[PDB]
Amino acid sequence: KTLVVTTILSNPYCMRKESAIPLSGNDQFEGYAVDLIHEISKSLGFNYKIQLVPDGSYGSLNKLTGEWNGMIRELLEQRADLAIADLTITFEREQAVDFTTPFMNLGVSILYRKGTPIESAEDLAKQTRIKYGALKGGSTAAFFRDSKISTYQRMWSFMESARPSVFTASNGEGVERVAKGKGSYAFLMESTSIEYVTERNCELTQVGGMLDTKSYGIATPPNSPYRTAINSVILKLQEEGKLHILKTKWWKEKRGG
């Protein structure tokens, strides 16, 4: 059979491949997610077409309209069979689509300069000289805004009250603000992104662990007949080392893409 796969550009999950000759179809794209679906399709014997989500969104719920956008909407409107991207499995998305077994685990962590005694979020919340922020309007900021845990409330109050603003318009802007800050600024974001950055900037490091836990998985329309088949392939690819090879390839070897 032939499936439509929706995805979104995000380094190094799905990137446009550089080429002197113009590329078409699936060859336009490369990255971890591109390789992952290639391997899944080999096991299960389907063909597929990768299509970027036309609206450029992951999928959020309009809470007063009930409508989804992004890759989620493509699934629910029968324009994609699978969504394969750095798409976070959340209780909310699980109420509208199904998710496979995760292919990657991650969590909020801290990007900072190497070689200081700052070892944890707790070390940042106990001090006031170092400023710290996050992407404006993103899920990292929401983790802090929404928390009822005293530690993270104190941090959110500090972040919201800092001037100039500690929130950035992009993750890259936060990375650069750390890199040029001489320790005056730390940036909270996904641990997988931090690893991507620290593989490419020897002066930076992750600080502490993962303050939350979450995963990326493939999304399907509810009751898709392909979900359990993909779950088994994902576990098999994992247990033989194929996903480990793909992670190293894209985070450590392809210094870009």
Add this chain to the structure above:
Amino acid sequence: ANLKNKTLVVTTILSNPYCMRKESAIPLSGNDQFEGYAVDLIHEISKSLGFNYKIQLVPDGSYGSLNKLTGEWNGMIRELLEQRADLAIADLTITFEREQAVDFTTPFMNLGVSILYRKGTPIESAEDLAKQTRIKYGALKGGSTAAFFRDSKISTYQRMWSFMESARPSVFTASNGEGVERVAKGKGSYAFLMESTSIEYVTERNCELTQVGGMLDTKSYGIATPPNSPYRTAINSVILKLQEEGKLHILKTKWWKEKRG
């Protein structure tokens, strides 16, 4: 389906710091005799969903392995299949093999194999170990780490597996604690491959040991249920909410860094 006012049997196994006997001047009874990460976790889940439960240690002291000759399971896996427990909460690895017999919830913890070694050597990775022969390296006999090496098709790990199987005297151990001691007393002559979470627990408590490199694979612990259990999806939602709020990370910090037994 509904869990309010129900009483569940929960099987577990002693394993630090998931489930440990609590110290007390007076003997403790029932659930109060145990403490640890898994004990706190099931308490939280029970409060959210409104059920009661009794913790019972698995009688045969085993996690659950499949005898391929006979088809028989043992351990906590068997207790679920024989309907003598409703849930198994422990450091029980979600594997494809176990998934063909029982169900698992959403994972509560993610981990992977890594290296326990002495602090401050030139060894930086598994690749460094694999390309040399002077430093010996091993794992727990018959466990998930050994199965990972046995099942890897990656050249590095397949090479390591061949080396470990060939080494005389045996590099395998009967417990993780024996492996830890072999690293400590080995002064660099021995490295031990085991779960990253166990390496973290050890290195928090022995300052001369360290983790070398990252994870060589990925695997998770989840709550196991009888197949087709009507409670799995309700528990999944509770776990996802604890994960998204950071409460499992806080629980891990408590049992790994704050408490000592």
